[PDB]
Design a protein around this nucleic acid. Structure first.
Ligand SMILES: [Zn+2]
Ligand SMILES: [Zn+2]
Lengths: 127, 214, 91, 97, 97, 25, 201
RNA sequence: GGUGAAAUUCUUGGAUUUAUUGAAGACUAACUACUGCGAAAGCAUUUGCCAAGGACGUUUUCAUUAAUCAAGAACGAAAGUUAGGGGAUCGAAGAUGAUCAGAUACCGUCGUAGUCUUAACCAUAAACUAUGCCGACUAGGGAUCGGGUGGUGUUUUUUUAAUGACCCACUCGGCACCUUACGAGAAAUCAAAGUCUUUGGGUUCUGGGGGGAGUAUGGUCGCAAGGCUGAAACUUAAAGGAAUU
């Protein structure tokens, strides 16, 4: 038996988040994003950025004392894409390679029951 | 240049007696000083944890359970049941094309003053010699089945309290009961209680709480 | 015979005050001056005085009501709602 | 001596079906048309599974899958999806592959 | 059902309409059943019920007002109470008691 | 031009013409 | 001077043999010869006077006490009502929506009569002529007719004067202005045509 | 944040992210299909009430009550109008960042009306199976929705009974589909667009080269927006439909 947290990855397009919490969620540990590392403003969603972020997050988790982590991976959801972005795979590989242990994995993208009209209009986003 | 993990205090979470094992987890809260003591910061917390983890059997790899913190005994708090939910992966694996889905809800009160909405689900099945693809129900069978499930859930609540209810939900006896009651209406695979959620609590009943120790 | 094409009761105002205003007034003044059915005696003898007060000619019962009609949609909703709440308590 | 102009042919429609939105462009398209697919994919790519199985407690662990139904408009499907474009004869065919 | 029953009694049997004639027939003991509208005043209803418990006579409460009861017994006026004193080809006494 | 927009053109023209005729009448 | 009708309700005095008469505002639906039940253990029927703790949530009441004993302050004019939108049984309070949109918190021991006050629909009708406004207000008070400051002289009003009829200064005027200087839109946090969702929360 | 990339915008007064609750209003995901109901428009959470309707079954009754129908009526998406309520989201107008030769367009961020409802108006739509309704006949095949019949049929039961669900055969009535051309068609294609120069089952509506013009004018309906009805002068040899390289 080891000590656990939850990673709570949000792999949108356009950025990534990796921020670990306690089992409750109120206690937050080691929040980092892909845009904090790279300074290009468009590679924020890149797997390299997600890997660097997860390396930092795992270092902070080891410093505080955290050995294992459950994973709740997420996309934007709602009325938007509800398909996870590129950084999720990268971050998972990263903080699996980086000493931490991986408990259970779950996809927690917020899905509606057909609510709240999407953005773009009727004819859609054109070009 | 403060590094609040100098002050954030490692702390334990113990589950009630009625799953299998109590040593659930460890949280971090803060150092309990004047001006926001820790026992008022950590008393509303909830903890979503897998029934596989707190029962030992991977058969409950789904069925996440929310436990809501209620008390403290010296870095060793005991918690209580707040809800049960299935996982998205299991729902979306169940939900297949070319069959009819049946959902039932009921708001019911226990023999104590706990009120709760309990959500069951079922899916039609194909009866083992069947040539056609689709296995749909009429839309009168469906309402018959919904009525049956509602009756069963209502009579299996206001029996005993949350303790015995959780003891029923864990080994999934209600599911077999629904199957037996719906033998004669429609076949019905994948019978489950998708959710049980609390919406009104009684007045804190520390006897019934602290009667969940070792 | 039919004496006015569309003004009806609001021909007492003639040419004055504007058509939209006379139309709103028409719609309400018809209800105002109508006869309604008594809930108590079953007859069509309910007329108003003194806005909010509806008397039966026979049966002499007087009901509190709307200003230009006996029952408002709100009060209808209220009696149904209150019925449902009472039944939620005792049934 | 009234005079008029063009005019046009036809596809079997319904009645009315409610629209959905394209997952890329947000265009409203009716469900009958609405090119539909089901993305069932493991959470992890086919290569990270080894690393994650090595790093995970809970042997066999679960390997769950993420499932989502995608609705594409015609334009977006033609620009991306495997829908591509067909001859007069092959476009009567209706089988998946 | 009760409406079709009454419609048979009104052409086959012997009835009287109105409060005074009910009370008269009920003092005389000729009445078997009385049907009472819903919107009748409660004092009138109580007086009738009491006369009926004295005469040992049956009482039906029509789920409908006096206009509806008039239509049910085939009249273009409103009636608040009906007395059935000889049923003819009907069944109304035993259908309910 | 698109018939939709030719129709809109003639409509705006038609109500302009109604107004200009009300000036006299 | 009141669009809402009144009900003359007659009760018995518990302590002396006599009839004490009271003047209620009539809820819509009440009628002559109707029994009105007033108190803690009275049934939920229109016209009855209950405590707002005894009533449930979603209940529609009128003539409801701000605090117990004032004998009716809120939801008293034609068509108006308060909604109960929650109880706090601890500290015997009750949260309610008033006809202005304000939420308020009142004692559960504050009474309220069930239903909506009669006379509703009154302000839908065009009053339509100055004589009808005259007869309205000659039974209320001398608030009519109203002359404009812009139409009068500078001694007589701040907006007065000018070779054109104009105000000259912002008609929005502070809450800390004093009497004689408060003759426009007082403490106006916005002005203009109301657009979109108000009652923002 | 957002993008192709950006900026506009928010941000250590601590945004974005996490957790716990609450309120508001809208919407009914996935299941959801060459499936259903409805005159069409259209209709997808549960439960109850109200009344309705088709198909099936019927050794029930009436007995030709029927079909289509100018006039004349009811319903009629969305937008829009009037007045109240509601007002989360998206978002005509508008404002702004950018791109651009320009860009008061596409993209981005705000966001009024509207989007919801109640009571009334409007009455149009690629309102499309641009195939009018009724009726009969004419080719094969399988599947499906609803109802019915039959089968020592399978399963669940209480091994074994009834029912329920399935399987087989048949049948009526529907949404449609695959194959072919005996035919039809300018062809595309069609089980109707066939049974039509071997020209006639019944009936309503509409069109007569393209423009001008669905305009002007007059009436009529409408609060208006507009709808319905609806020319002429003048001009012109082509316009147009399917297919071919
Ligand atoms: Zn009366
Ligand atoms: Zn698209």
């Amino acid at each position: 038996s080891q000590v656990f947290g939850v990673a709570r990855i949000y792999a949108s397009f356009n950025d990534t988040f990796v921020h670990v919490t306690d089992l409750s969620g109120k206690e937050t540990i080691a929040r980092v994003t892909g845009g904090m590392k790279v300074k290009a403003d468009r590679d924020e969603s890149s797997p390299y950025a997600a890997m660097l972020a997860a390396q930092d997050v795992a270092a902070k988790c080891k410093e505080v004392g955290i050995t294992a982590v459950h994973v709740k991976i997420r996309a934007t959801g709602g009325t938007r894409t509800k398909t996870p972005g590129p950084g999720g795979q990268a971050a998972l590989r990263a903080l699996a390679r980086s000493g931490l242990r991986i408990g259970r994995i779950e996809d927690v993208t917020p899905v509606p029951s057909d609510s709240t009209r999407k953005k773009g209009g009727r004819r859609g986003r054109r070009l | 240049v403060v590094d609040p993990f100098t002050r954030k205090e490692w702390f334990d979470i113990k589950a009630p007696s009625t799953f299998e094992n109590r040593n659930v987890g460890k949280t971090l809260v803060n150092k309990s000083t004047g001006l926001k003591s820790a026992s008022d910061a950590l008393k509303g917390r909830v903890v979503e944890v897998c029934l596989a983890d707190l029962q030992g059997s991977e058969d409950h790899s789904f069925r996440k359970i929310k436990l809501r913190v209620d008390e403290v005994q010296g870095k060793n708090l005991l918690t209580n049941f707040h809800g049960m939910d299935f996982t998205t992966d299991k729902l979306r694996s169940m939900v297949r094309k070319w069959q009819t889905l049946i959902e039932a809800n009921v708001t019911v009160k226990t023999s104590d003053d706990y009120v709760l909405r309990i959500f069951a689900i079922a899916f039609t099945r194909k009866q083992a010699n069947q040539v056609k693809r689709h296995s749909y129900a009429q839309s009168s069978h469906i309402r018959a089945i919904r009525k049956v499930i509602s009756e069963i859930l209502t009579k299996e609540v206001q029996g005993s309290t949350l303790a015995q209810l959780t003891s029923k939900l864990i080994p999934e006896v209600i599911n077999k009961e629904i199957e037996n009651a719906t033998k004669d209406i429609f076949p019905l695979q994948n019978i489950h209680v998708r959710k049980v959620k609390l919406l009104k609590q009684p007045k804190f009943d520390v006897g019934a709480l602290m009667a969940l120790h070792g | 015979a039919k004496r006015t094409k569309k003004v009806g009761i609001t021909g007492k105002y003639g040419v004055r005050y504007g058509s939209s205003l006379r139309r709103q007034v028409k719609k309400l003044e018809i209800q105002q001056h109508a006869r309604y059915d008594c809930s108590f005696c079953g007859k069509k003898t309910v007329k108003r005085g003194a806005a909010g007060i509806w008397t039966c000619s026979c049966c002499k019962k007087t009901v509190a009501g709307g200003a230009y009609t006996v029952s408002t949609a709100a009060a209808a909703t209220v009696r149904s709602t209150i019925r449902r709440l009472r039944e939620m308590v005792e049934a | 001596p009234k005079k008029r102009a063009s005019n046009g042919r036809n596809k079997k429609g319904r009645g009315h079906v409610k629209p959905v939105r394209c997952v890329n462009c947000s265009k409203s398209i009716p469900k009958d048309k609405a090119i539909k697919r089901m993305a069932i994919r493991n959470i992890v790519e086919a290569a990270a599974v080894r690393d994650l199985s090595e790093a995970s407690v809970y042997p066999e662990y679960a390997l769950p899958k993420t499932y989502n139904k995608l609705h594409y408009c015609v334009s977006c499907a033609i620009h991306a999806r495997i829908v591509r474009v067909r001859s007069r004869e092959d476009r009567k065919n209706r089988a998946p592959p | 059902s009760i409406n079709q029953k009454l419609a048979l009694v009104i052409k086959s049997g012997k009835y009287t309409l109105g409060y005074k004639s009910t009370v008269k027939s009920l003092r005389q003991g000729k009445s078997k059943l009385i049907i009472i509208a819903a919107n009748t005043p409660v004092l009138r209803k109580s007086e009738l019920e009491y006369y009926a418990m004295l005469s040992k006579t049956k009482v039906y409460y029509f789920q409908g007002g006096n206009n509806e009861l008039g239509t049910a017994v085939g009249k273009l006026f409103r009636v608040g109470v009906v007395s059935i004193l000889e049923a003819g080809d009907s069944d109304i006494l035993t259908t309910l008691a | 031009m698109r018939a939709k927009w030719r129709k809109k053109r003639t409509r705006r023209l038609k109500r302009k013409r109604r107004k200009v005729r009300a000036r006299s009448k | 001077g009141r669009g809402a009708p009144l009900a003359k309700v007659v009760f018995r005095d518990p302590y002396k043999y006599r009839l004490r008469e009271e003047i209620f505002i009539a809820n819509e639906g009440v009628h002559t010869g109707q029994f009105i039940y007033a108190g803690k253990k009275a049934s939920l029927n229109v016209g009855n006077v209950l405590p707002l703790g005894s009533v449930p949530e979603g209940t529609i009441v009128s003539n409801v006490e701000e605090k117990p004993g004032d004998r009716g302050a809120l939801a008293r004019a034609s068509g108006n009502y308060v909604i109960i939108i929650g109880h706090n049984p601890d500290e015997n309070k009750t949260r309610v929506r008033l006809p202005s949109g304000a939420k308020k918190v009142i004692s559960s021991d504050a009474r309220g009569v069930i239903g909506v006050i009669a006379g509703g629909g009154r302000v839908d009708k065009p009053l339509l002529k100055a004589g009808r406004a005259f007869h309205k207000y000659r039974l209320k008070r001398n608030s009519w007719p109203k002359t404009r400051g812009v139409a009068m002289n500078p001694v007589d009003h701040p907006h007065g004067g000018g070779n054109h009829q104009h105000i000259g200064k912002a008609s929005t005027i502070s809450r800390g202005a004093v009497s004689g200087q408060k003759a426009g839109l007082i403490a106006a946090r916005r002005t203009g045509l109301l657009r979109g969702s108000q009652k923002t929360q």
